[PDB]
Design an enzyme around this catalytic site. Structure first.
Site, mmCIF file in Angstrom:
data_model
loop_
_atom_site.group_PDB
_atom_site.id
_atom_site.type_symbol
_atom_site.label_atom_id
_atom_site.label_comp_id
_atom_site.label_asym_id
_atom_site.label_seq_id
_atom_site.Cartn_x
_atom_site.Cartn_y
_atom_site.Cartn_z
ATOM 1 N N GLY A 1 0.806 -1.207 0.000
ATOM 2 C CA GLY A 1 0.000 0.000 0.000
ATOM 3 C C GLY A 1 0.843 1.263 0.000
ATOM 4 O O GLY A 1 0.786 2.058 -0.942
ATOM 5 N N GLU B 1 26.143 6.633 -15.275
ATOM 6 C CA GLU B 1 26.449 5.949 -16.529
ATOM 7 C C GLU B 1 25.650 4.651 -16.738
ATOM 8 O O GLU B 1 25.843 4.004 -17.775
ATOM 9 C CB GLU B 1 27.950 5.672 -16.660
ATOM 10 C CG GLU B 1 28.790 6.932 -16.873
ATOM 11 C CD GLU B 1 29.288 7.218 -18.286
ATOM 12 O OE1 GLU B 1 28.626 6.785 -19.255
ATOM 13 O OE2 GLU B 1 30.354 7.891 -18.428
ATOM 14 N N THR C 1 1.634 -11.940 -1.626
ATOM 15 C CA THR C 1 1.564 -11.167 -0.380
ATOM 16 C C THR C 1 0.252 -10.384 -0.242
ATOM 17 O O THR C 1 0.143 -9.566 0.674
ATOM 18 C CB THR C 1 2.752 -10.207 -0.134
ATOM 19 O OG1 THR C 1 2.764 -9.180 -1.122
ATOM 20 C CG2 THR C 1 4.123 -10.848 -0.092
#
Lengths: 428, 201, 426, 22, 201, 22, 426
Positions: free
Chosen positions: A135, A245, A170
């Site tokens: 969340g 880079e 999850t």
């Protein structure tokens, strides 16, 4: 001097950041107090007599995971108000974390960011750690990036997002959180790296032979990758490439900044006795499809671009012999418009093993982070999941009750469809 | 101060060393109390250790070893299961070499002397008898307890019996072997025992 | 930080709640006299969620005791751990609604709700921000169902954003307690369906079945049954009180189990559950937690889940435990039992780790499952409710207590509609 | 009969003041 | 004459010091009576302090430490609350370091010997025996009392049990840790301890 | 009968004999 | 320094003020025999506000007893701490007022005033420099209400610039003894509006309701409830006797509660108040103090303050405490409960701190609030007065002592404008 600010938002951000910061302490020899007995200036500041404090912020609207940091071993290491705690949970709601509850914690975060940024010039960029499944990791993670991109324009912003597993999640509302995150991290993040949970589960299974791993076991390996990625800044090397880079060599188009991750070797005390850890062998295991850390079999795409980091006793001519073998091998395919697509980075300093962990002490290591076209698969599968559940307004009423308007789901979906098409048209 | 602070070993060590520091300061920018680096103790008394054939072995001949304390109980089924594997490991380690590398000193949780002798008759490595308070002080120092019977000073019980702890020169734990621990990787965590790094200096 | 306000209403709510505070006090090491024992930090860093400091060193529970008659108040107060509660937290009636929903919700509960709403507001406003409310009551009774649901309507209007967790017991299929059970159940449901954020269903038939086949206890009283119910009450809120590898609270459960707002009814299971004799025979491993967790024998709702399909499910694992076998087994159960899971949602299952095990054990799990097989209980109530209402039995008290007849037709229409909407996804 | 509380977190078990390499 | 004039330590120190002053003055503008700056005492006699192994240690062992007296009662719920945090603070901030920073000396306010030894068994730092007059004399010196039993001389009580007070070489109150005082920083006042500037020297 | 007076003022508690610096 | 001269009139005046001196003497450490004990400096540093040395070491109160009967002053003298008062400070009457205000104020009191006013001149002048007086009396009575106010009239003229402050107990609202209440109350009030600086209102019905709802005392005597009134008496005058972080005085309360000269009637409350059962379990803090003090349950005046508006309120704190919680709680209470506070005066609260608490307690607060919810008290007397006066009830008792009929009309009019004047600010 040359500094990089670390941001950890949400459960996943904080727990990973705990693993990241403990490695850096052991790396440079600083203590839980923060005072050592000038490589460390990239991570730690200078304060009082001999003490160094981290250049980090911890954000969560849940207190119980960031308070536990204040309670633990590293009390005195962290700044008292660099760990900002809310009062009420985000509860897997992007709308809650972006509109309702997260608003009063953004400006508290920006206060700490600008005061930590203004100590010296030459700030390289930011590291972002969040879970797009969560969340506050997705909602508050986003909201910070609009406020950061408008003011600190110039500077690099690397993201290390823990993308949801295809099989394990999850959460059950996480397709909704995923589509909304991936809409709003396109134009606010310069380089995004996909981390996956079951990808590191089965690495821990077949390499380290740990039948019973946990989140602490996973976060050690992730902290090694972050240390290997930024080892060029901290320690001198034969051929170094910095934070800035990466996006020059990995990001060929503005829309295309999603890339894999892989670290090799990952060997315990079991196997470490019984091979050469030769530069050829560790780069062979790096490109192995079983060693991907994002759970997408990369053979069904083209390697758009590739970066290889090296640590320890690695000579330049062994890299060139290694990379020539990879080009020769036709399992790994390349896109036509990028005939040369390897940027090497060599650092002299070998990785430092945390005691009683699971990695063995090794002479050299490779951290290979690569942009491919196989990412279009994991975006498509997530897309298919979102379309079934959305089509009859499941879980919508949570989101639309919390402030967001029914039509941000449609706009985010079509924008993801543009991302589908963009990866498709490039890879032909 | 390693691995613990509130242990009888560390308390006796702090007493002796700070005594010695005060006498050196009396005899002579000296730093009181002395550093943990400058602290010194003698760990196994001269009459502490004894071999298989019941002859005294001094501490000084533990030089150049990978030495481990084996906290074990006679009656424990887990101990009885662990014992043959450790026996095979000890044999195959000490045989493939001219000179021996690893060494195990036995610390007992047995109920009485009869049980101690009966269990000790199997073992070919070194052992400390039950009546010596070395066993108890080492047990508090390395946080071994079968059950919470003795007051420990805010410690968590690091191990359950059985446990092998690799020790260093100054009582610092060299490495932890997870039989019944955070890893629960029982009966074959003995493979994790490295011997480059764990030397009794 | 966060605090849960506890409300216990009616006979059955109060006896459950009395047992609930006993295991929370045990888990946090609170002596019955009020003080602290045990001497560890992990017991106490999150105490504000259920307790309050009293400048004498003692912790008072964050609870409200609610009944329409003082009989069951006396039992809780005179029990062990009975001096814990603040005496003013109790509220009394004198009449006592004779298991009549109307009399508890319109006549006798109305004049009392003034007083106890003050006690809620006293405790609610008292802190920084509250996390939410937790309510234990009985849907079969008068003072538990009728007056309990009235408070749910009241406190939802005053605190809309805060969550709403109810531990309710239901009428059983076989045994008859309180002959007007379907009247009280139907009238409670069509109000509790729009005013409660998550509802978790317990049935006494399921509890006796657990005492038959799992615990092998030969004489379980309400003392034993409430212990198991209380164990899941602590298990669902473990992570609020203790740290863990992956966090969860009640709103984690809400956002991950509620596809549509109308459907918020759960099945609760606790694992492991073995007899005294079989305590030392069983290998407590994550494989054997999840196989017992997915058994009809283990659910505390007396509706067989193998008939229906799990729309969504949640599992709050507790203890020192490895998270791959946590993560893989939730995925692995979805692969073989593909027929038991709905298709148009990927990965129906949510998992969390709560690294402080319950007292006396090493690992545990609490299962909160949104299953469409809970339709079988609702059909039985509607079938019974239509059996009596068609001939208008037991109505004259309900219609003679300032309640219209058309409330009944709304009650059966809403609850039948709840039955109908489970059907299309099955 | 009582038993003492002897549990500590994953954090306490795994995250200590580690000795530095020489 | 610090912190209070009317204390047994101060009167004992006064007696000894001006005893020596008169003796050497008779033996010889030597200032009489001697300045409190010129005054020096031995705060703990030879047999006062005993550690976790019940081994007596002299006062001279406490040089270069940050020492704090801990007035504690076994049965007090506030002491029951304060004890684990004190243990943890001692534990970590002493362990995680290249110096041995602090030391705690326990002074009892318990009923009797049995209670005193029972509470002292739960404790890893040093203590003074309850029979030994020094505990009562320290209580009067630092003006700690559970209740008004022993007559303070028309002044306030500095604090109540429990209390942690950082002390100096001469019984001087280095700093008062605000556990249950004006600040009322319960269990968090431990972090106010500055161990640099307060050394028992 | 009565009790003695065991209250102490704020001022006496925190305005004490302060130690003279070297 | 400053001295207050205490004055008591009537049986209610003598009995209430008797308990006032018992708690002052306890606070300052004076024995019944009159010697000091308890060797504390604070106790004697400011003792001359109330006491008076004898050049023999003993202390006498600066009190003037006054009653029109010899009976009630024999009760005061013969008890313990009755030996404390000087025998010459008593002033006796042989006849007495039969709860007839006329004979108290005109006939019987006229021969007695010249004697008691002889005493009060002698005692007051003899001190260093006076600060104020105070009067404790009842307005339902004869001599408390009748002859009491005649003293108030005559010394106000004599000592024009000194503070005058009254603890007057009004007629009880509901159960009302001494049937000539409104005649005594209204006649006393319109005489007390032009001649008193502070007036504090206590009712018995307010006090008895405290004894169930808060205190929960079974059989409370006048002795028990006078402990509460006297503790309120000590609270308003703390700073005259003890040092403070922020000082106060009787004069500071006048200029910060009286916006217009006639609006000097106050509500009195005390906090904390707990049963002996609930004593060990209650957390005593300043936020908890300030919310038990803003209650209708806590005022000693039987008028609900939620029906009106606090024109200006005050709270005098006593104890070792910090200074936000005295003042941030003021902003806390004014912001959210913005309906019970008048608008055209921003930030209506006077606050003060006294360090030494009442004996046995660590913190306390007394509340003095100028409300327009006291219109519902004057009105209730006003109808009961005009109900009786219309039909000339009990007027012959009043008109036979030299009164005229026009005085009663003036009594209502000067009462009724005070009713209307409170109305115009609400």
């Amino acid at each position: 001097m040359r500094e990089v600010i670390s941001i950890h938002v949400g459960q996943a951000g904080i727990q990973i950041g705990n693993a990241c910061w403990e490695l850096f302490c052991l790396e440079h020899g600083i203590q839980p107090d923060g005072q050592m007995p000038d490589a460390f200036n990239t991570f730690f500041s200078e304060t009082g007599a001999g003490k160094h404090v981290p250049r980090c912020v911890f954000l969560d609207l849940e207190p119980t995971v960031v308070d536990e940091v204040r309670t633990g071993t590293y009390r005195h290491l962290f700044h008292p108000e660099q760990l900002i705690s809310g009062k009420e949970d985000a509860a897997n709601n992007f709308a809650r974390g972006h509109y309702t509850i997260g608003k009063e914690i953004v400006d508290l975060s920006l206060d700490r960011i600008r005061k930590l940024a203004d100590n010296c010039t030459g700030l390289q960029g930011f590291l972002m750690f969040n879970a797009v499944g969560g969340g506050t990791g997705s909602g508050l993670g986003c909201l910070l990036l609009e406020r950061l991109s408008v003011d600190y324009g110039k500077k690099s912003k690397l993201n290390f997002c823990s993308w949801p597993s295809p099989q394990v999640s999850t959460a059950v509302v996480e397709p909704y959180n995923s589509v909304l995150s991936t809409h709003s991290l396109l134009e606010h993040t310069d380089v995004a790296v996909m981390l996956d949970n079951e990808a590191i589960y089965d690495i821990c299974r077949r390499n380290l032979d740990i039948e019973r791993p946990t989140y602490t076991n996973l976060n050690r390996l992730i902290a090694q990758v972050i240390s290997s990625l930024t080892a060029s800044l901290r320690f001198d090397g034969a051929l170094n490439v910095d934070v800035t880079e990466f996006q020059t060599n990995l990001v060929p188009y503005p829309r295309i900044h999603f890339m894999l991750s892989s670290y090799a070797p990952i060997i315990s005390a079991e196997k470490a006795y019984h091979e050469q850890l030769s530069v050829a062998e560790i780069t062979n295991s790096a490109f192995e499809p079983a060693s991907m850390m994002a759970k997408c079999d990369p053979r069904h795409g083209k390697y758009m671009a590739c970066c290889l980091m090296y640590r320890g006793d690695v000579v330049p001519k062994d890299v060139n012999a290694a990379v020539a073998t990879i080009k020769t091998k036709r399992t790994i395919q390349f896109v036509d418009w990028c005939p040369t697509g390897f940027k090497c980075g060599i650092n002299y300093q070998p990785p430092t093993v945390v005691p009683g962990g699971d990695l063995a002490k090794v002479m050299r290591a490779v951290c290979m982070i690569s942009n491919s076209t196989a990412i279009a698969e994991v975006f498509s599968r997530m897309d298919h999941k979102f379309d079934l559940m959305y089509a009859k307004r499941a879980f919508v009423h949570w989101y639309v009750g919390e402030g967001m308007e029914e039509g941000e789901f449609s706009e985010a979906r079509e924008d993801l469809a543009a991302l589908e098409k963009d990866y498709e048209e490039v890879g032909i | 101060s390693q691995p613990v602070f509130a242990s009888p070993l560390n308390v006796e060590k702090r007493r002796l060393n700070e005594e010695r520091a005060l006498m050196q300061a009396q005899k002579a920018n000296i730093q009181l109390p002395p550093n943990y680096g400058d602290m010194d103790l003698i760990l196994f008394p001269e009459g502490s250790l004894k071999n298989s054939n019941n002859t005294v072995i001094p501490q000084s001949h533990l030089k150049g070893k990978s030495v481990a304390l084996y906290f074990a109980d006679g009656a424990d089924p887990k101990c009885a299961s662990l014992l043959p594997f450790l026996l095979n490991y000890y044999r195959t380690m000490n045989e493939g070499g001219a000179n021996q590398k690893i060494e195990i000193i036995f610390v007992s949780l047995d109920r009485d002397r009869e049980a101690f002798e009966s269990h000790r008759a199997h073992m070919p490595w070194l052992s400390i008898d039950l009546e010596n308070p070395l066993t108890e002080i080492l047990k508090r120092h390395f946080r071994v307890m079968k059950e919470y019977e003795v007051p420990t000073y805010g410690y968590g019980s690091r191990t359950g019996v059985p446990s092998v702890i690799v020790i260093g020169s100054d009582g610092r734990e060299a490495q932890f072997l997870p039989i019944c621990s955070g890893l629960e990787e029982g009966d074959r965590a003995l493979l994790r025992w490295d011997w480059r790094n764990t030397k009794f200096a | 930080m966060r605090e849960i306000v506890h409300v216990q209403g009616g006979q059955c709510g109060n006896q459950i709640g009395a047992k609930f505070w006993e295991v929370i006090s045990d888990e946090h090491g609170i002596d019955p006299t009020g003080t602290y024992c045990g001497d560890s930090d992990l017991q106490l860093e999150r105490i504000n969620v259920f307790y309050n400091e009293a400048t004498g060193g003692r912790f008072v529970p964050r609870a409200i005791l609610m009944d329409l008659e003082p009989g069951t108040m006396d039992s809780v107060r005179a029990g062990p751990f009975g001096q814990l509660f603040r005496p003013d937290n109790f509220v009394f009636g004198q009449t006592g609604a004779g298991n009549n929903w109307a009399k508890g919700h319109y006549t006798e509960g109305a004049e009392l709700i003034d007083s106890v709403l003050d006690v809620v507001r006293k405790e609610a406003e008292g802190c920084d921000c509250l996390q939410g409310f937790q309510i234990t009551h009985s849907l079969g009774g008068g003072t538990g169902s009728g007056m309990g649901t009235l408070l749910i309507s009241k406190v939802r209007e005053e605190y809309p954003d805060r969550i709403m967790e109810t531990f309710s017991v239901f009428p059983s299929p076989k045994v008859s307690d309180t002959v007007v059970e379907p009247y009280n159940a139907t009238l409670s449901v069509h109000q509790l369906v729009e005013n409660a954020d998550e509802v978790q269903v317990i049935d006494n038939e399921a509890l006796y079945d657990i005492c038959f086949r799992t615990l092998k206890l030969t004489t379980p009283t309400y003392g034993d049954l409430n212990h198991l119910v209380s164990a899941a009450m602590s298990g669902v809120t473990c992570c609020l009180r203790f740290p863990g590898q992956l966090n969860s609270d009640l709103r984690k459960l809400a956002v991950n189990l509620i596809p549509f707002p109308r459907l918020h009814f759960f099945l609760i299971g606790f694992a492991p559950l073995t007899s005294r004799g079989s305590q030392q025979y069983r290998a407590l491993s994550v494989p054997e937690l999840t196989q017992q967790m997915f058994d009809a024998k283990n659910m505390m709702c007396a509706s067989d889940p193998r008939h229906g399909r799990y729309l969504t499910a949640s599992a709050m694992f507790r203890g020192r435990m490895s998270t791959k076998e946590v993560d893989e087994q939730m995925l692995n159960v979805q692969n073989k039992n593909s027929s038991y899971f709905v298709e148009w949602i990927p990965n129906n299952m949510k998992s969390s780790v709560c690294d402080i095990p319950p007292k006396g054990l090493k690992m545990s799990v609490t299962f909160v499952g949104n299953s469409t097989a809970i339709q079988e209980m609702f059909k039985r109530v509607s079938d019974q409710f239509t059996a009596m209402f068609r001939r208008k039995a037991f109505l004259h008290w309900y219609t003679g207590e300032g309640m219209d007849e058309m409330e009944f037709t709304e009650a059966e229409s809403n609850m039948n509609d709840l039955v109908s909407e489970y059907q299309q996804y099955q | 009969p009582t038993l003492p509380f002897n549990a500590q977190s994953c954090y306490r078990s795994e995250y200590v003041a580690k000795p530095l390499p020489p």
